[PDB]
Amino acid sequence: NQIDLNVTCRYAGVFHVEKNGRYSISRTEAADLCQAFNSTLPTMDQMKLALSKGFETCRYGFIEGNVVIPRIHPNAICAANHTGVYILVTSNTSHYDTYCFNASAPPEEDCTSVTDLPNSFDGPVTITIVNRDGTRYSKKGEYRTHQEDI
Numbered sequence: 244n245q246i247d248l249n250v251t252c253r254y255a256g257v258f259h260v261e262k263n264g265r266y267s268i269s270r271t272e273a274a275d276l277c278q279a280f281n282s283t284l285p286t287m288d289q290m291k292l293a294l295s296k297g298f299e300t301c302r303y304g305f306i307e308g309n310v311v312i313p314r315i316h317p318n319a320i321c322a323a324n325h326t327g328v329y330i331l332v333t334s335n336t337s338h339y340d341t342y343c344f345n346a347s348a349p350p351e352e353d354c355t356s357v358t359d360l361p362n363s364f365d366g367p368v369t370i371t372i373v374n375r376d377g378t379r380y381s382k383k384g385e386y387r388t389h390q391e392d393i
């Protein structure tokens with residue numbers, strides 16, 4: 244009963260969260276997960292500021308209202324060479340990664356490790372935050388509030 248949450252640097256308080264290293268988060272689980280990080284889904288404006296601070300990924304993830312990939316550098320295999328906040332227009336499917344926004348974060352690039360999920364609740368799941376440098380923080384708990392997600 245174990246969940247890995249892969250997280251990134253924060254950029255103006257925005258970071259990327261990838262569940263179990265695969266597209267596997269629904270829109271409702273996304274909201275709950277950001278809540279567990281005392282965070283919210285970013286707005287498009289918040290994402291655009293993050294991007295300007297140096298944030299890019301090669302993964303689809305939820306923000307408030309859309310599924311996007313922030314791109315700085317054009318790369319053929321990431322959002323088809325687009326730069327800027329690329330918006331997913333057409334897809335059959337509903338599960339992606341998520342982005343989260345933490346207002347308490349530093350204003351620009353913060354590439355320190357994440358070492359807590361301060362707002363997770365009581366539960367049976369071993370939840371592991373995995374940083375990009377491999378550093379890990381684990382705790383027993385739960386964050387999903389929708390039965391359909393469990």
Ligand SMILES: CC1(C)CNCc2ccccc21
Pocket residue numbers: 249250251259261264373374375376
């Ligand atoms: C950069 C990213 C999301 C890419 N997929 C693997 C992984 C693992 C730990 C932290 C971050 C990542």
